């Protein structure tokens, strides 16, 4: 006995979307359903209780229902701020447990492209005294959430020492990422310049630093 939700859902701004939750007679078939909304990096918040009731602060854009062994969360007048993970929950009489659905990640369509802002830091003199040199390339406020990051040494593609994070959704619905080029102090001073090149939606932004 599990609660099954589609992992992803989407809708257009100003339109509606329905998120389904499938269970069995022992949980949804005989008990109230609860819904929870979770924004990135925050604790979940109660969204719906007793299958169709809203707590204070939840707009009537959000509505819940249940029929048989399934339940549904409907959201109308979709806004970009509704992008979140939505979980259903219910008590199961057989297992004597609260069950959660796997969660449904809601995407609101039509959000405009946003080019990344790129900031490149050379190593600090403190790290250089330890014979190490970490270059830091910070990438923020881009949309959609997919970038390619390449490093250059005197304009030649760097292979060793690159590590780049997955994109993570920011609170403003755009994305952030970072890339690290880990060098020795000798390698850093061995080239005239280093570059961090960030490609996003077919266009690139490149920053360059040089050992001064």
């Amino acid at each position: 006995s599990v609660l099954t939700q589609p992992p992803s859902a989407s809708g257009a701004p100003g339109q509606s979307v329905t998120i389904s939750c499938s269970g069995s007679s022992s949980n949804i078939g005989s008990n109230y359903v609860y819904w929870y909304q979770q924004l990135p990096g925050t604790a979940p918040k109660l969204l719906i209780y007793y299958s169709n009731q809203r707590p204070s602060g939840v707009p009537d854009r959000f509505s819940g229902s249940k029929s048989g062994t399934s339940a549904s969360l409907a959201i109308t007048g979709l806004r970009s701020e509704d992008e979140a993970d939505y979980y259903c929950a219910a008590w199961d009489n057989s297992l004597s447990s609260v069950l959660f659905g796997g969660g449904t990640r809601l995407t609101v369509l039509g959000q405009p492209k946003a080019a990344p802002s790129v900031t490149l830091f050379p190593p600090s003199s403190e790290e250089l005294q330890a014979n190490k040199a970490t270059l830091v390339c910070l990438i923020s406020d881009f949309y959609p959430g997919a970038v390619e990051v390449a490093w250059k040494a005197d304009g030649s593609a760097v292979n060793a020492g690159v590590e780049t994070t997955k994109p993570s959704k920011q609170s403003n619905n755009k994305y952030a990422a970072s890339s690290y080029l880990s060098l020795t102090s000798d390698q850093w001073k061995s080239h005239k310049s280093y570059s961090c090149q960030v490609t996003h939606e077919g266009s690139t932004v490149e920053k360059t630093v040089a050992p001064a």
Binding site: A43, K45, Y49, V98, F100, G103, T134, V136, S168
Partner: protein
């Protein structure tokens, strides 16, 4: 103001026992509430662990945890706690404590057990056989390039997560961006926290990043100078 706050070790070795507590304020632990633990593996979904009922001591647990779980409470400290034995990587998660609220249903009852209306901030527990490692903190010194200046702190080579960074003891909040950490091939994390400031302020204003790595009980306040 009902408030919950988790505390406990961020690193637990495989096969040992995870132990966490939740300090409750703004309300007595003896209230008629299902004092609940819920967890969420990084990047995955919620899982209910169980509760202890404040006015009886009665407990109920998720059978997925297979008799590994004990939830207790302490009235003298106004806290409840979680013990999870024989942990594995499947037990790495952010652990939340939570409290229900009373909503009357159509027949006059409160069904509190699946209602989580007040949540703690959550505590990350990483189940790992690798050792704790405190960070080295280095200054990151400096549409636009120089009307504003990005300065920051590189928090290098730590384990496990998390690290928090504030700036000027929390007095500086505008323009702060603390990035998600990178996991390097060494198995150690690094992150960078940056604040964007008016370039004029680089003389008249001191900037200090307040780094906290609780798993190594280590705080570093690093002055960032140009």
């Amino acid at each position: 103001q009902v408030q919950l706050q988790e505390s406990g070790p961020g690193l637990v070795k495989p096969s040992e026992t995870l132990s966490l507590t939740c300090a409750v304020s703004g309300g007595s632990i003896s209230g008629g509430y299902d004092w609940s633990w819920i967890r969420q593996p990084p990047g995955k979904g919620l899982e209910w662990i169980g509760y202890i009922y404040g006015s009886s001591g009665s407990t109920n647990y998720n059978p997925s945890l297979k008799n590994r779980v004990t939830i207790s409470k302490d009235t003298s400290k106004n806290q409840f706690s979680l013990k999870l034995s024989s942990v594995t990587a499947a037990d790495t998660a952010v652990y939340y404590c939570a409290r229900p609220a009373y909503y009357e249903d159509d027949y006059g009852y409160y069904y509190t057990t699946p209602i989580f209306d007040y949540w703690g901030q959550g505590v990350l527990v990483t189940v790992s056989s690798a050792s704790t490692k405190g960070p080295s903190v280095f200054p990151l010194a400096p549409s636009t390039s120089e009307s504003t200046a990005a300065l920051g702190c590189l928090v290098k080579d730590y384990f496990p997560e998390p690290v928090t960074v504030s700036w000027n003891s929390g007095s500086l909040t505008s323009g702060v961006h603390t990035f998600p950490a990178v996991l390097q091939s060494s198995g150690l994390y690094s992150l960078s926290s940056v604040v964007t400031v008016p370039s004029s302020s680089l003389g008249t204003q001191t900037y200090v990043c307040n780094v906290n790595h609780k798993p190594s009980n280590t705080k570093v306040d690093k002055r960032v100078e140009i």
